[PDB]
Every structure is written in structure tokens, then in C-alpha cells.
Amino acid sequence: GAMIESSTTIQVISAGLPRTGTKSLKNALEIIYHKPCYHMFEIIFNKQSDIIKWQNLIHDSHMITTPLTTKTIAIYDKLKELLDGYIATTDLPTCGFYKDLMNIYPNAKVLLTIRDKYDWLHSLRKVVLPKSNDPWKLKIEEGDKVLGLNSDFYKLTEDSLKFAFQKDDLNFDDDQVLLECYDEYNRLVQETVPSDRLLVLRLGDGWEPLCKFLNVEIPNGIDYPCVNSHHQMTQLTEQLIKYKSLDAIIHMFPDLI
Template identity: 30%
Template sequence: MLTVIGAGFPRTGTSSMKAALERLGFGPCHHMFDVGSNSDRAKRWAPLASHDTVPDWEYVLEGFRSSVDWPASFFWRELAEAYPEAKVVLTVRDPQSWFASMRTLIDNGPARLQSEKLAPEMAGLVENMMTTRPLLERMIREGLGSDSPFGVVPDEKETIAAFERHIVTVRESLPAERLLVFDVREGWEPLCRFLGVDVPEEEPFPHLNDSKMMEESIERLMKGEKVGLPFHPVE
């Protein structure tokens, strides 16, 4: 059962939030990394590409206590209704830097994964991406308001406008006592206060560079090296 629901768009510090929530005892925390690395998880999400699917959230998110990033955060409203006791965290960042990060994600993720020169070690990741592609396309279409083909960077002006609309919608849809609007640069204190837990002593807030991790991990995968998700090297 989820106790913390992430409502922020991808590239708004979601990797940092995953690490922070797990450090605070709200893990495991579901992230897009979990879909890309696990074929069973990808198959659980795939039917949600259709509006006709009635999600069984206990099945889709089995084993997780919190969630961040798409695909889960795309369904923030449904999850908030399904788990009325859960708290919601809306991660935010500067719109222009967010779009630049999205551009990096698309250029170094979907676009490259559709190329022909792929190492055999990438087969599982590519298969999982293809399994969830209809859902990803739905999220891009409805979340970003874009009809750009999968793997193509959408229009900057329209995408930033969608990003800003999303923030307003979430803020207006949930009571203040249930929602935290949070920039990961604020560190532990506002997050811990909101969740009612102690601030980790003498421990810095985890600031993970999503774009850098993605770029470096794709490079290693292209070379045939094993990579564990969320994009940490495998010994």
C-alpha cells in the first residue's frame, strides 16, 4: 500500500526523491527505472495504455510503499483517490532547465535505444520499453500535450506550458495538508517535516544527476557492459 505518492513530472529530481524516500523508510520506491529493468513490471503497466483498463493498483505496484516518476506520477490523481491516507509530493524545478533535461533524456534514451547498433545486453531494456511504448505515448500525448513521435523531442514552448499547467492542476486539486510542493534543492527539512520523520543527522540529501546517469549508463550499455538500475554499475 502506497504511503507517499509522487506527482511531479519526470526530470524533477525523481531519482533523488527515490533515494531520499527509501532512506527515510518509505521504500521500496517505484520509479521508471523499475519498469525498464523488470519485464514483469513492464507487463503490469502495459494495459494502462488504454483508458478502458481499470487499474488494480495493488497488483501494478505490488511490493512498493512509495512512487515517483512516470508512469506512476502520470496517474497521481487516480492514486491519490485509491490511497486517501497517502501523502502527495509534487516535485518542481525551473521550467527551462527541466526541458533541457527532458531533451537530454530523449536524445540519450529512447532515440538511441531505437538505433540498430545495440549490444545484446540491451535486449531486455529495449523489450521492456517496447512493451510499455503505447503507455509512454499516451503519457507524452496527454501529459505533455504533444503529438511528437516516440523518441522525438517535443516543441519546447508547448511542453513547458504543459509542465506549468500540471503544477497548477495538482496544487488546486489536493488539500494543502496533504500536498508538499518540493524542490529537491531544499534538502531534508521540508520533506521530513511533511512526512513526520526525523531529519537524518549529518547526512546530505541525495542529489542524483538524472541526465548524467542516463548518458553514462547508455554509453556503458552500448559497449555491452552490465548496468544495474537505477543505472548503477553491476559488480
């Protein structure tokens, strides 16, 4: 196809929860658009200084009104500022703001990444939210310290998930609670977003439906990304602990990071 000059603004809002292929999707959008896509990894590796800013936004987000009041404009401006220079959003903490992002970026299209709820839960427990008594939790915390992630990071991740599920009293150790929130969250996205503006991507769907939805060619000779498996994250955590730095090992994780 012909090459056209794309605007550096949010063009794709992905409402999918972590462990549904968000990092692969982030990489896929960057291959298409040649500009950055937001993700929790963007905070971890490039934008740790914005942790407090995401926290402040969540703190004020209860004051959002779905016309537009004056308090919502202030919140919307901080969201737009946080995303300046990016062409898409995926993952926490952005995903729970999908409805507000649709208002801020009226010409952006919306994606929902989904998968089997039990596969999701098991992936979540291995990587990002182990049960409190799971010994692997202590390894995650040790690797996090190597990356410079402290208590404010843990607050932001939890608070952003509570915001996405619209539930402050969240028993993170309760599998049935989490599964119920996952199903209700995905149902609400599909009920909320007009179907002309939504594409639901199940894990493994690949380039095709995404590229058709976005009116772009499939990137020639590039396989759709497959990164961030729970096995690969376990290796990343163990390698961070072993070497005590990211830069000692980053060349071993060329696409994940």
C-alpha cells in the same frame, strides 16, 4: 526519535514529472521507510514484466470517473496490484494517476517536485526525450537494447506522458508544446490537491521540508540524494554501449541503479 512500525502501503504519492528529482526522491523515501518506492527505474531494472500491465491500465484509464462507479473499481484494483509492496510512487508512469492514487490510498500524502521549466526541458532533451533528429537518440536506443527494452517500453513511456498531460496529439519534437504542458500540469496539481495534503519540493530543497511533512527524523549522517544528472545518464548510456551489459558496469553506478 523512537522507532515505530510503518505499514507497507503507499504513504507518499509524488506527482512530479521526470527530470524534477524523482530518482533522488525515490532514494530518499527508501532511506526513510526501508521499503521500495516506485519509479521508471523500477520498471527498467526489476519489473519489466509489468510494462504490459501499465499499458493496459492506460488503455482503460479513459473510462475512469473521478462517487465510484464499477469500471473505476476494476482500474483501481489493477493499480493497487501493481503497487503492492511499495511505500511510495514517483515518476512516470505513476505520476499522471495522482488523483486516482489519492482515492485508492486516502491516507497517503502528495508531493510535487518542480524546477525551472527551461532546465527541465534541457534535461529532458538530453536524457529521455531527445528531438527525433538528434543523433544522441540513436545512442539511447542502443543502450536501451542492452537493457532489454524494446518497442513496448517506448510505447508505455510515450503513452504515460500523454496520459499525464491529458493530450493524445502530442508533438514530442515541439519545445513550446512541452513547456506549456509542463506548466499546465504543475498548475493543475496545485489546484487539485488540498494544500494540507500537498508539499511542493523545488530541486535542492533537501531533507527538511520533506521530513517535517512526513513526521520523521532526518536520516542521521546521510546527505540527501543527488543522482540521475543528465551527465551521469550520458555516462550510463555510453558504458552500456561499450560493455554490452548492465552487470559488467552496475558497481560503477552504486546509487543511481
